[PDB]
């Protein structure tokens, strides 16, 4: 993302806060409105904002050059901030589950994106497709979070649940829909691209990119150079654990059963030692090459009048 893109995007955030905390309306509840301004200011604008900026990039690469006015690029930025409000509601739910922030702040921040959509988009043709997309992505993300939770019982990982089929479903529902599909489908709708076949072709490639993203992330959690990775300690349904269980003989399976998802640092080292023994680094190297090649092929094959450069830009951001 360019300096211009990053700065124009960040310039919108203070307007979003004023919009949601009823600036100019003279509210009967100033103390709780002032608190909500702090909830937004403290939790929404501080990250890398990759999902929000991806919404702007998608719109710029899908729209006709002649329709790329400062006004339309700003609307794309506002949609990007709606994605970042959803991201913030999900990160807040994570902070609450890990332990100023109240439990209902995640519901409140999620609800706030619909107020922003109504303010800026209610008179445009893309309004109902956009609100229906957010509704559907919200429901699917909740299904993904619940599927992830069904891999744990009484504080212990259920290793029988750690299948590649279940892993692929968790990544798709919990992460890929809101992280990869939502920004691109928002860009398409703002560019008045409603063709189901176009949305379907984009979704197919973006779910593939999303799966590589999460597998790379899972690999680096254990084998990256250090934040310090806690997936093993937390008993997470990670690609490493799924492939470990595929490759394990009964003795190796017993090591996973005894030491996976334990608080003792020694147990994390025992699992890392097993991942090394099982050749998960070499397996990841093969997956990375084969997955990159398949995704590059599918992007080159993209039809229905969709631009390739958008998907290559997204892919190159993940693989580098």
Ligand X SMILES: CC(C)=CCC/C(Br)=C/COP(=O)(O)OP(=O)(O)O
Task: List residues near a second copy by CB under 8 A.
Answer: 26, 28-29, 31-33, 35-36, 89, 93, 96-97, 100-108, 110-112, 114-115, 118, 122, 127-128, 131-132, 135-136, 138-140, 142-143, 145-147, 149-150, 152-154, 169, 173
Residue 254: which of Mg ion, a second copy, ligand X, none does it interact with, CB under 5 to 8 A by kind? Answer: none
Picking from 65, 14, 66, the residue whose alpha carbon sits closest to that of residue 40 is 14
CB 284 to a second copy: min, Å = 25
Q: Give the interface segment with Mg ion, choosing from 23-31, 89-97, 156-164, 194-202 (CB under 5 A).
A: 89-97
Q: Which is nearer to ligand X, 98 or 266 (CB)?
A: 98
Please give the angle made by the CA atoms of 291, 256 and 209, to the nearest 5 degrees: 20
What is the rounded CA–CA span in Å between residue 313 and residue 5?
Answer: 15
Residue 139: which of ligand X, a second copy, Mg ion, none does it interact with, CB under 5 to 8 A by kind? Answer: a second copy
Report phi then psi at 248, rounded to 5. Answer: -75, 135
Picking from 119, 127, 43, the residue whose alpha carbon sits closest to that of residue 87 is 43
What is the rounded CA–CA span in Å between residue 313 and residue 319?
Answer: 10
CB atoms within 10 A of CB 152: 16
The answer to whether 231 is annotated as binding is yes
> And the tokens for 263?
């608080």
Cβ 233 vs Cβ 244: under 8 Å = no
The answer to whether 98 is annotated as binding is yes
What is the rounded CA–CA span in Å between residue 272 and residue 294?
Answer: 29
> And the tokens for 191?
């560019």
CB 193 to a second copy: min, Å = 19
Residue 37: which of ligand X, Mg ion, a second copy, none does it interact with, CB under 5 to 8 A by kind? Answer: none
174 interacts with ligand X by CB under 6 A: yes
With CB atoms as reference, the residue minimizing the distance to Mg ion is: 98
**Residues 98, 154, 225, 309: which binds Mg ion (CB under 5 A)?**
98
> And the tokens for 102?
């109240």
217 interacts with Mg ion by CB under 5 A: yes
Name 29's Cβ contacts closer than 8 Å, sequence gap at least 6. Answer: none
What is the rounded CA–CA span in Å between residue 149 and residue 170?
Answer: 10
Cβ 202 vs Cβ 184: under 8 Å = yes
Q: Which is nearer to Mg ion, 94 or 289 (CB)?
A: 94
* Contact mark string toward ligand X, 79..108, x via CB under 6 A: -----------x--xx---x-----x--x-
The answer to whether 148 is annotated as binding is yes
List, in sequence order, every residue forming a beta bridge with 153; answer none if it has no partner.
156
What Rg, from alpha-carbon coordinates, does the chain have?
21
161 interacts with ligand X by CB under 6 A: no
- Per the annotation, where are the binding residues? 94, 98, 148, 217, 221, 231
Q: Which residues contact Mg ion (rule: CB under 5 A)?
A: 94, 98, 217, 221
Q: Which residues contact ligand X (rule: CB under 6 A)?
A: 90, 93-94, 98, 104, 107, 141-142, 145, 174-175, 236
- Per the annotation, where are the binding residues for Mg(2+)? 94, 98, 148, 217, 221, 231
């Amino acid at each position: 993302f360019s300096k211009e893109e990053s700065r124009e995007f960040m310039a919108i955030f203070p307007d979003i806060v004023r919009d949601l905390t009823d600036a100019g309306r003279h509210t009967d509840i100033p103390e709780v409105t002032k608190r909500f301004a702090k909830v937004l200011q403290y939790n929404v604008p501080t990250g890398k904002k990759t999902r929000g900026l991806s919404t702007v990039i998608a719109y710029k690469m899908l729209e006709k050059p002649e329709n790329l006015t400062p006004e339309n690029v700003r609307l794309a930025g506002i949609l990007g901030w709606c994605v970042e409000l959803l991201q913030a509601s999900l990160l807040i739910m994570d902070d609450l589950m890990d332990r100023f922030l109240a439990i209902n702040d995640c519901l409140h921040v999620e609800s706030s994106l619909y107020s922003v959509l109504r303010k800026y988009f209610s008179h445009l043709p893309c309004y109902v497709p956009i609100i229906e997309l957010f509704h559907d992505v919200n429901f699917k993300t909740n299904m993904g979070q619940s599927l992830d939770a069904l891999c744990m019982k009484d504080g212990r990982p259920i290793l029988s649940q750690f299948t590649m089929k279940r892993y692929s479903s968790i990544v798709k529902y919990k992460t890929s829909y809101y992280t990869f599909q939502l920004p691109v489908s928002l860009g398409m709708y703002l560019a008045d691209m409603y063709d189901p076949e176009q949305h379907r072709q984009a979704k197919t490639i973006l779910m593939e990119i999303g799966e590589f993203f999460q597998i790379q992330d899972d690999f680096l959690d254990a084998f990256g150079d250090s934040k310090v990775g806690t997936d093993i300690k937390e008993g997470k349904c990670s690609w490493l654990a799924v492939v470990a269980l595929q490759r394990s003989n009964p003795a190796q399976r017993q090591i996973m059963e005894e030491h996976y998802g334990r608080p003792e640092p020694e147990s994390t080292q025992i699992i890392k030692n097993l991942y090394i023994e099982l050749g998960l680094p070499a397996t990841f190297a093969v997956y990375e090459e084969e997955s990159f090649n398949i995704i590059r092929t599918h992007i080159h094959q993209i039809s229905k009048g969709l631009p390739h450069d958008l998907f290559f830009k997204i892919m190159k951001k993940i693989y580098k």
